[PDB]
Amino acid sequence: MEKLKLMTIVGTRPEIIRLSSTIKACDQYFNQILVHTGQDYTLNQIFFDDLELRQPDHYLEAVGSNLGETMGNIIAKTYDVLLREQPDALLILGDTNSCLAAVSAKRLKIPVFHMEAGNRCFDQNVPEEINRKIVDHVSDVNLPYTEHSRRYLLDEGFNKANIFVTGSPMTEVIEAHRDKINHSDVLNKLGLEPQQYILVSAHREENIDNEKNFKSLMNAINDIAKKYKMPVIYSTHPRSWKKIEESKFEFDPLVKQLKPFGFFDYNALQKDAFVVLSDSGTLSEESSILKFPGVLIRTSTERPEVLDKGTVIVGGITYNNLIQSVELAREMQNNNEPMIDAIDYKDTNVSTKVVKIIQSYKDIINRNTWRK
Amino acid sequence: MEKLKLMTIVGTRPEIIRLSSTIKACDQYFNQILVHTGQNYDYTLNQIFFDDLELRQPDHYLEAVGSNLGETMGNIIAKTYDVLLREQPDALLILGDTNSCLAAVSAKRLKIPVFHMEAGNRCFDQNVPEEINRKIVDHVSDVNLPYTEHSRRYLLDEGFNKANIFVTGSPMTEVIEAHRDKINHSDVLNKLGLEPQQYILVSAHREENIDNEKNFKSLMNAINDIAKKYKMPVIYSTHPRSWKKIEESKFEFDPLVKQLKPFGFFDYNALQKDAFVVLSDSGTLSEESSILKFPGVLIRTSTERPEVLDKGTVIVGGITYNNLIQSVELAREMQNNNEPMIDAIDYKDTNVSTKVVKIIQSYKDIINRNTWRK
Amino acid sequence: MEKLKLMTIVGTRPEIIRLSSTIKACDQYFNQILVHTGQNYDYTLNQIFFDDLELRQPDHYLEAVGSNLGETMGNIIAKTYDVLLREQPDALLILGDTNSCLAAVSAKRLKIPVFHMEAGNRCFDQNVPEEINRKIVDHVSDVNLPYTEHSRRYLLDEGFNKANIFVTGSPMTEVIEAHRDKINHSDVLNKLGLEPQQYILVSAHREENIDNEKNFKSLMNAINDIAKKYKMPVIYSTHPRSWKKIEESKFEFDPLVKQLKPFGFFDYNALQKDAFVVLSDSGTLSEESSILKFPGVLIRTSTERPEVLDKGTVIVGGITYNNLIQSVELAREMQNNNEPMIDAIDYKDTNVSTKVVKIIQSYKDIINRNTWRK
Amino acid sequence: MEKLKLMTIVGTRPEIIRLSSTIKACDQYFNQILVHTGQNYDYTLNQIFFDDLELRQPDHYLEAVGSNLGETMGNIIAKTYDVLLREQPDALLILGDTNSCLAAVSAKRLKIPVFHMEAGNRCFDQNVPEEINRKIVDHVSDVNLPYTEHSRRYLLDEGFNKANIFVTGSPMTEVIEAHRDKINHSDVLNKLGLEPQQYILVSAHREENIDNEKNFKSLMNAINDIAKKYKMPVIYSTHPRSWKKIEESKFEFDPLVKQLKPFGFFDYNALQKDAFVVLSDSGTLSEESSILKFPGVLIRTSTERPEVLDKGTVIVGGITYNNLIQSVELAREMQNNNEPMIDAIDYKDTNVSTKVVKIIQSYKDIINRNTWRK
Amino acid sequence: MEKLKLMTIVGTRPEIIRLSSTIKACDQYFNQILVHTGQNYDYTLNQIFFDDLELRQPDHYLEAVGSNLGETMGNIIAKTYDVLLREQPDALLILGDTNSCLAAVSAKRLKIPVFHMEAGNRCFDQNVPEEINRKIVDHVSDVNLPYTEHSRRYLLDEGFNKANIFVTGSPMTEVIEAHRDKINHSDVLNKLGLEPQQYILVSAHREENIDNEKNFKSLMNAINDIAKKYKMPVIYSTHPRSWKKIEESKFEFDPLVKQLKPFGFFDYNALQKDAFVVLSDSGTLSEESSILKFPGVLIRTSTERPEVLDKGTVIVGGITYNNLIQSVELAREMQNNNEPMIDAIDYKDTNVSTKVVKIIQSYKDIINRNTWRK
């Protein structure tokens, strides 16, 4: 007997990392066509080496000069591999262009399952929020992480029949590899002593290319080095480092430039840090699971479930609240003050919840939406 | 003392099974008059079945029913209206979406507070018959007690009174508890001589899983090829009507497929819980598979129990041959990989009986005041 | 040709008066089977009123009604269930919130599209007995045609289907139109020995304006101190049980108040228009006052006609003495100062007949493909 | 360093108890300026209160309050408005629906982020004086911190900003853990010479349970025939405007009914926990009975704590003699049989303090950007 | 006779102007007590003001006000409560989002029904200071009376009582009607000696269009380049504070730019209608230009009058210099091509005075029974 043919599409790190355990299970129980769009030196590490994940059945080589082309391609290329394979159903995660795949899918009346549905920061100025909107509303079955997201989705009048709450995939994903995270010798290979180094991740566009903001960050990254006197392990984009000349320099001795690390290594680093300042998507969750002090360096969060439990503090950019936040963050953890699992992160069986939703709801959408 | 007069109105077996524990507690703490809409006068043979539930018999058999589904509805309104006039009870307690629950229409015209368990029960497929009464009985009830937050949500969107909804939980976990003794000490396996994990169960009792001449072909054809592929008996509990229509042309479902007798809850749950796989359309399945952690495959096109799909407790087989197979193969393949069965959020609680009781005592008066003014 | 076979189901007079114009059309464009829940045996005197009105007579009568409200519901369902099963209509028409329109409950089971005019009627006081049927039939109906945006809103918020709602607008302007020759050419001012603008009219027919002991006292006490204050006739139409009780201690009443012999539609409105002030509790009090611009003072403590307050074409007298005095003092004191009466939006169109006809044709097949899928 | 400057404004005692755990925390992590609206010029009491509870002394006392509610309301706005303008704080922390938290209306003008715990409190009876201030402060505050998911649902539906609603959980489960020994190593049972499970407790402080002449009757009546029925001591706690009102012939209700000397927080709860049954009209009755698992009976006709009925931690007596004796019988009848007492969901967590700290830092600067564009 | 006792409470000239036509009808039909929150102490201007509006003087003058926006809020609450006790009026009539309508906080504590015109005003910019009181006084009012069907929708989505909202339409048409005599015969063009269509009007009264220095620069800079490009005199009405800080180097701005005195409703409207272009932030502009059909450009970032953008009767020029010049061109360049000005739907009705009066006599009591159960 032929097994259900699913197509699963990824493009960025976190796409690949959160799907990581959901892809391995969709191999077990389905006939999974793994597509990969256009877009990386240290993404070959988390694929293959860390996640020990199996090769894609297609790389599409989308990319191009200028955003407009890339978005164009992904739609077109995606359109073809969806004609050429005719899968019964499509898996998509999140807010990247690599899930503009949903538009082509929808045209070819192929049912769409979207994990990381209903994601809302409620600031238009965040680039993510343009797709986020489109693709929530074009995916036939929406699988949001939280109930916050299920609420958000119902409120924009999306079919309450075709919503299921997976919970976060990131508990399961961290669990699977927990061994490798605690056995990471990454500390011993940077000569770093647990709770005596501060890790920073300013990767985001609105924290570098916007002018006043980058200034606020950087001035604080110094004062944070000085105020505690442990090495600051600063992980950004290269341009961000080349751009930090313009005769500002200072950066104490202590502020180090930091190689982009794999999953285990970067987590192991996070887990045993003094404080983490990250604009990372995974922070709100990484901090809640691996139990560590994170100041979240955004002006908005899509992960409120965590504020509801006192697991995170929201820095922002203006210098004072970053400082205040990090002093709050440590003072708190220095009084062994409770840090509780968020409700929707407890379940570690996301992989199988989704495989069962796809088997269940492929026909049901064909029957309902498309009338076959 | 002076006690609260509660008339609890029922009519179908599953109705009762779910009220089973709930009725017991209403006898304890109230003056419960238990009305039935059906007959007792073939029911000195079938009195065991629904005493063996360890339950007192009803105080009143309305012997409603007539020529057509119509006369029979008509009756249940009038015959209830009457028994409600006679006993003049303080509150009406009602389960689910049967024709019994039109009793609410009568109690309502008579300004008796109405308390409807299993509220907000939605599969969103108007072609499903249950869904007609569901809509009516939810909106004419005064206190709505859905099993789930899903079902609270559904009610709050249809614009029902915020103040008068409570999430009781599913009654099943508690029932199954007050009988897991009877279940675990069940011969049924040794009566039918089956090894545990070496038989497959198929419960197919619904019009539109029996009648729609096409669906009955996709299924019979799949009950065959299931037998063929696994090579184990295939205990098949359906209606008599189908047995009439299957004794023509196609015998093809092997020696292995067998007929079932009726079997009381106690026996039937011991038969489900050790089955290799269970293909049911019984509304329970969703709940029973969560509780008695077994491989469940819903042969429907719509659920009122999505809280299960949220947790990964069930797979929905559907009614097309091809998926009905893919679906069983997915069930077995994941039990054999020892994947997890996980408790739904609203199925965790076992104190539903006592939960309703306080609710009824509380909101009896609150409804006379707010909704009627007295 | 063969034409759309359309059962139309009525009960009370007010129900038929509104459906009047709308039936007449259905008769021209469709194969309309009219049907009446009550009795005809006696009717060989009533015949007049509900033929004078030029309305043809029901194809069937259901001689339902029983020992108690309760028998009689139980009847209309089973009775209506059959009239449908026989004549096998393509679709059901229906108006308002009488027990006559539990007809839907059956029509729904038998997979007949129901169209329900006077949809989304709400006053938001469940003490008002109409509020019980209102909720039920709106949710069992397949297409709701409310008179106003107001109700379309009410409905959407009860989470009803966006796509199966149309605002017919009030059918009362179309019907008052079709009879304004038979209204402006009526003797009924002569008949009763009355000059125009020289007589108050009072209609208290609602129970609980009447039965309720205090409400009677206030109301009666008022109709008095009105007649003395304004010193003109006070033409009064109530039920008999009130007159029966009026011959008591407070017999006084005063010589100016008279009884009113029940007069046909034409005559009753011809009365109301040329009246000095009107106190009624008819649902029509709101609409009629609007369409024939006269001062009306609703004896109630809720409307389902807010649209009329949005334009200032009615005061709400209520039930208490002190108010009704002021409300009527207001009413007159305003029409004395030439203050404007304004058409409400949803009362201006007069094609409600042809609208329903065009809507019923359009959506009949839709409601099958969609809800029932054939 | 600099720290965030948090003004915490308080008024009534229950406000200060719930904030107790949360205040001690903002002191630890912030520059907290605690402000009381009432008068200090009676020193002792304002300081024997804070002492047994271990809360610090307020930096400031607003000696507002005037001839009437109206003068005193407006004194809080203007005196509050001033304390805010002087201290130029970063943010405002507020609990509940006392006249104190009109302070928001001031803060909001001076563009100070308001954080408002016990948000979305709704019992849906506008008769109940709290529901006035409830609507107002909820909707002027910039971040609403509702105890439960219920109160979130309420708020979202009043279309408050999605993005600034966080569910803290109830702060009682924390306050009550933080004084758990002070309770269990407490004398109050020796002090008064009572064996556990051997005394009933009655607290009726709410005006309208007391100052309403009918309700007063039924309660005193019901406290009477309780004392007689169960023949135990009945430790009564009520305002003295009521006591003084016992002198005129209805003084009877047996000798077992005692007065109550008020008791600090620790001791009153110890009294409640070990009680046979508790009647009270405290909003704390709901929570206290859940967390210390004793059989409570709310003497109201509305909760703002429906979460507790979702689990069956409580019964609602009402004010009627009948439904009160009944609801007490149930409580102990259902205690007798060791029926379960289940933790409500939003009463579980006990870090409500650290939640509120982490939130105020997070969202203070967010509000300045979003609302006030700085 | 004995008539309903209304207390209408005002505080500001533009408040009064809108009520002008409503107030007059309230002297006719009720016993109206007209309270004011400020002082008269100034026969000189406070008498000439009520001269033109043909309006009786206020019955009372609370003189509320003091040191800071805080004292003055606090007082309107206390001083309103006092005068509300004394007169024990049956109902309170209130307009808009001034501090004067904090009157409803006090009245609401004395269970006096509150009626609120200009209900449901939302521009949706939380930085705009009216948007604080708008939120409070909408949610503490008992019956809301929005101008627009927009503002109904807005009030409905903050979950306000469906039964207690009524769309009056805008009161401005009515007040312009009740003068357009005085307007069409105005010497203000003779007096200031401007030919019609040959001057440009700029009404810049809002703080935030004056105090926020960048806004003040982008506007002044703008007023010049307009004076210059068109070569017409520029009637410019603003506050003292600007003039004082406008003469700071760049006081020279063109000979063409001239000074305004205040001018009456009649004169300023008369000046408006015959202007070439009119730049305003006066909320009126949105309406004043739908009605007296002139080119309006709104110097603002938000509108509480979308109904106008729906029909194409105004351009929102905003505060940034560039978009201002483009906006004013777009006005002239469009009026020269003679492009359609069109009536806003909710601005057509002219019987708002009466409309309210009936709605008060009606819901005065409905509210005492429903909200206050009496």
Describe this structure in words.
- The structure is cut from a larger assembly and holds 5 copies of chain A.
- The first copy, chain A, is an alpha/beta fold.
- The first copy, chain A, has 2 domains: 1-185 and 345-372, no CATH class; 186-344, no CATH class.
- Helices cover 42% and strands 12% of the residues of chain A.
- Chain A has helices at 13-29, 43-50, 67-85, 101-107, 129-136, 147-155, 170-176, 178-183, 211-228, 238-242, 263-271, 283-289, 319-333, 350-370; strands at residues 5-10, 31-36, 58-59, 89-93, 112-117, 141-144, 198-201, 232-235, 256-257, 276-278, 294-296.
- Chain A has a 6-stranded parallel β-sheet with strand order 3-2-1-4-5-6, with helices on both faces. A 5-stranded parallel β-sheet of chain A has the order 9-8-7-10-11, with helices on both faces.
- In chain A, helix 4 links the parallel strand 4 and strand 5.
- The longest helix of chain A has 21 residues, at 350-370.
- The radius of gyration of chain A is 21 Å and the shape is globular.
- In chain A, 56% of the residues are buried.
- The interface between C and E is medium-sized, with 32 and 29 residues.
- Chain A: It comes from Staphylococcus aureus (strain Newman).
- Chain A: Keywords: Isomerase.
